[PDB]
mmCIF file of C-alpha atoms in Angstrom:
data_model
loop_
_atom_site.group_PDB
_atom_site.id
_atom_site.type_symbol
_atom_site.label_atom_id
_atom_site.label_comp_id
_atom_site.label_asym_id
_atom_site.label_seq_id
_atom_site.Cartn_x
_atom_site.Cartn_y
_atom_site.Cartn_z
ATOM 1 C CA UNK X 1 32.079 10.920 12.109
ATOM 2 C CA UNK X 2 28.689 12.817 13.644
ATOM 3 C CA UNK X 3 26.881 12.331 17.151
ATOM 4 C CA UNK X 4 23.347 9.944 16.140
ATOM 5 C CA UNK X 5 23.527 7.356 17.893
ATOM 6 C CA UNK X 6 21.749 3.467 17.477
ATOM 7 C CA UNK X 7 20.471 3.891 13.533
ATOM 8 C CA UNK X 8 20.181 1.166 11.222
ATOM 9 C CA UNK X 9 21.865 1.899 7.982
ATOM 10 C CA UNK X 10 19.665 1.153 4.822
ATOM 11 C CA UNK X 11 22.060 2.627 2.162
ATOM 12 C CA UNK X 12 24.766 4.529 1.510
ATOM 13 C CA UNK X 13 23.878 7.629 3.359
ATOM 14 C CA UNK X 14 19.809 6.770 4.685
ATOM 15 C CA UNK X 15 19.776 5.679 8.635
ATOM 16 C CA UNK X 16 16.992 5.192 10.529
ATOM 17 C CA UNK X 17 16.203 4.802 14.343
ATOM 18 C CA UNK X 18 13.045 4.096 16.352
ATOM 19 C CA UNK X 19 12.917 7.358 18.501
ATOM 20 C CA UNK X 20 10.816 10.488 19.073
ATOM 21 C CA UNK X 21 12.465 13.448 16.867
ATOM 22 C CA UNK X 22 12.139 15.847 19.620
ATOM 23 C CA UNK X 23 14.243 13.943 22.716
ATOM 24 C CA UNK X 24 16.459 13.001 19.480
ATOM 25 C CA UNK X 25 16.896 16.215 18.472
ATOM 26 C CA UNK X 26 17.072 17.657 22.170
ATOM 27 C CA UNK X 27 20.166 14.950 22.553
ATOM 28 C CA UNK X 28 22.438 15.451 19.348
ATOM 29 C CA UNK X 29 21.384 19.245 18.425
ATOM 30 C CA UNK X 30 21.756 18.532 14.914
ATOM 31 C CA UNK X 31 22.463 21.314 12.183
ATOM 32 C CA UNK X 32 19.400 20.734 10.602
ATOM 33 C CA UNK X 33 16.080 18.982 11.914
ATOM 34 C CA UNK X 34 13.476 18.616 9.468
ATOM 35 C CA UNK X 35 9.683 19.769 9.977
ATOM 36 C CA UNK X 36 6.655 18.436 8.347
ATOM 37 C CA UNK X 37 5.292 21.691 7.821
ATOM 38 C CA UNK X 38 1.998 22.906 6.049
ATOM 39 C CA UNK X 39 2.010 25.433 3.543
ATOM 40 C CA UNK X 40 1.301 28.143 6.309
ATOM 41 C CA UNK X 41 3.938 26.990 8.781
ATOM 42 C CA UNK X 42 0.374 26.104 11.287
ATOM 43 C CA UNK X 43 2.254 24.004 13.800
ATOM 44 C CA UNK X 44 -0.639 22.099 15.394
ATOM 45 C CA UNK X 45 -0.430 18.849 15.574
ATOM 46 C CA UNK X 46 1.933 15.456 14.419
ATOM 47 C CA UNK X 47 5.447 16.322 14.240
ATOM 48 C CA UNK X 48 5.115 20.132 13.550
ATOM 49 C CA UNK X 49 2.985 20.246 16.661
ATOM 50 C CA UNK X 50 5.194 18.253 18.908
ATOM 51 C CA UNK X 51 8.664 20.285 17.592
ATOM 52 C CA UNK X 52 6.740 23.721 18.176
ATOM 53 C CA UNK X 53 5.389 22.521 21.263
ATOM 54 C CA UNK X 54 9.006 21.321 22.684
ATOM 55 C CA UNK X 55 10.156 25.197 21.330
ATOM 56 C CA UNK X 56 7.272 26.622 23.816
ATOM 57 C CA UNK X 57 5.957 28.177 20.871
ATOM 58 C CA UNK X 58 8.562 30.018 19.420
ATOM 59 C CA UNK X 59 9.016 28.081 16.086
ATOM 60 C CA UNK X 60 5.103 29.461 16.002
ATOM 61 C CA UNK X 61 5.596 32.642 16.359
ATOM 62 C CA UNK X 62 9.051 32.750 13.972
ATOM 63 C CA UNK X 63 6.742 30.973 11.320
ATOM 64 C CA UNK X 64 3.828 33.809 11.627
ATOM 65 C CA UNK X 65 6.065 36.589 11.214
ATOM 66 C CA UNK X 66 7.798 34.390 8.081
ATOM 67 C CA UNK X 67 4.214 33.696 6.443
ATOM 68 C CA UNK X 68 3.200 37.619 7.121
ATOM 69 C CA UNK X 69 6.488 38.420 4.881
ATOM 70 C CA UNK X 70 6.498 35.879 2.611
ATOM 71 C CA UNK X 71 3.255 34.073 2.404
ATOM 72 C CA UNK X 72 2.837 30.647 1.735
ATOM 73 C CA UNK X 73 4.940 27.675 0.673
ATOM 74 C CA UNK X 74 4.150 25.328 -2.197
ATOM 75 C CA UNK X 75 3.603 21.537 -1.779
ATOM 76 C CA UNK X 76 6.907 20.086 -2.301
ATOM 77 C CA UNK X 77 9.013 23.027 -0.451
ATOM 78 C CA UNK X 78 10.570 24.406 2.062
ATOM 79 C CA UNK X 79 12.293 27.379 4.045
ATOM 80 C CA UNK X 80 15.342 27.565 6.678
ATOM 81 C CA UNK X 81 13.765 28.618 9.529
ATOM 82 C CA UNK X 82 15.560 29.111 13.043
ATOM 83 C CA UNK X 83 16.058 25.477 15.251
ATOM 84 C CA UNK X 84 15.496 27.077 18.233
ATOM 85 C CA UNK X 85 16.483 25.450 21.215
ATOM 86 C CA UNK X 86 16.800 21.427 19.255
ATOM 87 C CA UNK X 87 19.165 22.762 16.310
ATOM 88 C CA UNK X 88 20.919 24.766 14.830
ATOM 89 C CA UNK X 89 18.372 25.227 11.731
ATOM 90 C CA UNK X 90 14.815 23.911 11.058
ATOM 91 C CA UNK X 91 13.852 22.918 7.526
ATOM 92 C CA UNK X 92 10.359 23.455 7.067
ATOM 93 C CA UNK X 93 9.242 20.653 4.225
ATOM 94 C CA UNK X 94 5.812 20.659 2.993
ATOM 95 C CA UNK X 95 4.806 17.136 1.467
ATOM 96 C CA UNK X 96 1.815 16.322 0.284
ATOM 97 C CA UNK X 97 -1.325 16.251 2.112
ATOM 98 C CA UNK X 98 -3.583 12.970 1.262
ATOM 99 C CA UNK X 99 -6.150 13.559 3.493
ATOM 100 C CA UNK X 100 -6.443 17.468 1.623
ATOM 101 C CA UNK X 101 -5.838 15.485 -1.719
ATOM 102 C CA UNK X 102 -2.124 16.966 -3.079
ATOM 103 C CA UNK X 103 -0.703 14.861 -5.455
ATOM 104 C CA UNK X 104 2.314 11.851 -4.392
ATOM 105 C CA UNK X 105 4.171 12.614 -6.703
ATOM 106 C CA UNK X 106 5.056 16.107 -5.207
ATOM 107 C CA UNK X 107 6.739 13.230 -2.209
ATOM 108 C CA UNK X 108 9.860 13.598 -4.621
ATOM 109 C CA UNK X 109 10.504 17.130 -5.014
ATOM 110 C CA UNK X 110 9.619 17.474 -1.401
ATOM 111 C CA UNK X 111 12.802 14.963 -0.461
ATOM 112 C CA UNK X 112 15.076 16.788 -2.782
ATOM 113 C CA UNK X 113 15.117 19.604 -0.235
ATOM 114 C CA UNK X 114 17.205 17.621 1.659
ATOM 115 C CA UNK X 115 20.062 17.659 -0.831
ATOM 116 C CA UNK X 116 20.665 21.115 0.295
ATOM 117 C CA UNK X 117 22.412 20.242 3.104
ATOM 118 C CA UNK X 118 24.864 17.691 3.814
ATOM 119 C CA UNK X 119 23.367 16.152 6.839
ATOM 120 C CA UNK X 120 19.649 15.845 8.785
ATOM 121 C CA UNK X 121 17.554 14.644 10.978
ATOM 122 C CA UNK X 122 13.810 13.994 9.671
ATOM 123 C CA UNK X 123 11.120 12.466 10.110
ATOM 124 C CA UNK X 124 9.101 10.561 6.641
ATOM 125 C CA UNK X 125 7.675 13.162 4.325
ATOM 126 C CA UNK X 126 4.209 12.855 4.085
ATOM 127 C CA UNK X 127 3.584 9.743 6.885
ATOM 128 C CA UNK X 128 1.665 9.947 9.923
ATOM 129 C CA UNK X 129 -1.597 12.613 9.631
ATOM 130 C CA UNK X 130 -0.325 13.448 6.023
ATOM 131 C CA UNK X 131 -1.988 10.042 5.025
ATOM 132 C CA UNK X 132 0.573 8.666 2.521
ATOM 133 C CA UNK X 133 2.047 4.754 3.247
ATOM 134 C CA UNK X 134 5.111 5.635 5.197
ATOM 135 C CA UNK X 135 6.608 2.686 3.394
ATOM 136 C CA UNK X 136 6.302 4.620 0.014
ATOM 137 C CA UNK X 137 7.844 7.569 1.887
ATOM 138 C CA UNK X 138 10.795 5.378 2.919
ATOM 139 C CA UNK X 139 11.369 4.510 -0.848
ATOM 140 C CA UNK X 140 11.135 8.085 -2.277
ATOM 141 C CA UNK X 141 13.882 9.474 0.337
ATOM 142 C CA UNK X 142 16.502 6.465 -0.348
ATOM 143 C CA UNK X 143 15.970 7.305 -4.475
ATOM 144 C CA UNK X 144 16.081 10.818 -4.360
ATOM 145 C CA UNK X 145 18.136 12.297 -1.070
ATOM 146 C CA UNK X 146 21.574 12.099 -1.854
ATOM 147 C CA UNK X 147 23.083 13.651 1.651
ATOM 148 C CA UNK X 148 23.284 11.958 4.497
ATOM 149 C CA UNK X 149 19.803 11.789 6.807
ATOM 150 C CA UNK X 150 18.982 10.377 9.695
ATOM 151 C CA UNK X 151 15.354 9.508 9.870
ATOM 152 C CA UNK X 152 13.009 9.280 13.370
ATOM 153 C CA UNK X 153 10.181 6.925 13.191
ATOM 154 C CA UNK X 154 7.883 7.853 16.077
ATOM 155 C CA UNK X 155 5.761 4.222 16.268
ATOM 156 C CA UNK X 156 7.687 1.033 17.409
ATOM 157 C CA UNK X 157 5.640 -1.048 15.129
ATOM 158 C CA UNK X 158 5.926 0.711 11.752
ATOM 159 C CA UNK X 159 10.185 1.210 12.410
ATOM 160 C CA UNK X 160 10.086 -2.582 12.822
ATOM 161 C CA UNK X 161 7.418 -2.717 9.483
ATOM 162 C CA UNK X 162 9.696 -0.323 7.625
ATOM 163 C CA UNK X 163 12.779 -2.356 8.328
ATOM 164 C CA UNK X 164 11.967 -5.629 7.352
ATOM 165 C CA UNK X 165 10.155 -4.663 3.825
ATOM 166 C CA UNK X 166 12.764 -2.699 2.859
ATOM 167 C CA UNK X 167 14.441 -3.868 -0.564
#
């Protein structure tokens, strides 16, 4: 048994919920919340920019410091950055950019990031500014994530969209 609360289940071990991924994560304090990061961790705007925004800029300056060390991510994956103050860990994902013209089929090895750890909250890789059909998104994470995630659709209209194409 876990804490979400009010998700549809679509398979096995996919849920989804209508609800803004901060005040979710803010209410259950998962293990894991999922970012949809960039390759250099720039937090500015969609979800990255409203998660670092609710952390009053410390998933920012965390993610500096990590890019300093490290440099950048790929397209397709990820590091275990602090949660800060909505959970325990956040998993930085980077899936591809459309509108920067990164290929969808990096979408899959993006997901299978999740199948490091047994449960999450996320948002859909590569939706909203990243410019890929969020119903395409919905398709890659029940076929390749294997642990149990919880996914946060911001926009009341594509949740309902998402839920009564899916197969």
């Amino acid at each position: 048994v876990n804490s979400f609360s009010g998700y549809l289940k679509l398979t096995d071990n996919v849920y989804i919920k209508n609800a803004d991924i901060v005040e979710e994560a803010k209410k259950v304090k998962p293990t894991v919340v999922v970012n949809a990061a960039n390759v250099y961790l720039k937090h500015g705007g969609g979800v990255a920019g409203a998660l670092n925004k609710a952390t009053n800029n410390a998933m920012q300056v965390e993610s500096d410091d990590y890019i300093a060390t490290n440099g950048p991510l790929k397209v397709g994956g990820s590091c275990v950055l602090s949660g800060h103050n909505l959970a325990k860990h956040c998993l930085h994902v980077v899936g591809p950019n459309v509108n920067k013209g990164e290929d969808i089929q990096l979408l899959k090895s993006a997901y299978e990031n999740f199948n490091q750890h047994e449960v999450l909250l996320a948002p859909l890789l590569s939706a909203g500014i990243f410019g890929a059909d969020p119903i395409h998104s919905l398709r890659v994470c029940v076929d390749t994530v294997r642990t149990n995630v919880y996914l946060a659709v911001f926009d009341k209209n594509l949740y309902d969209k998402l839920v009564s194409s899916f197969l």
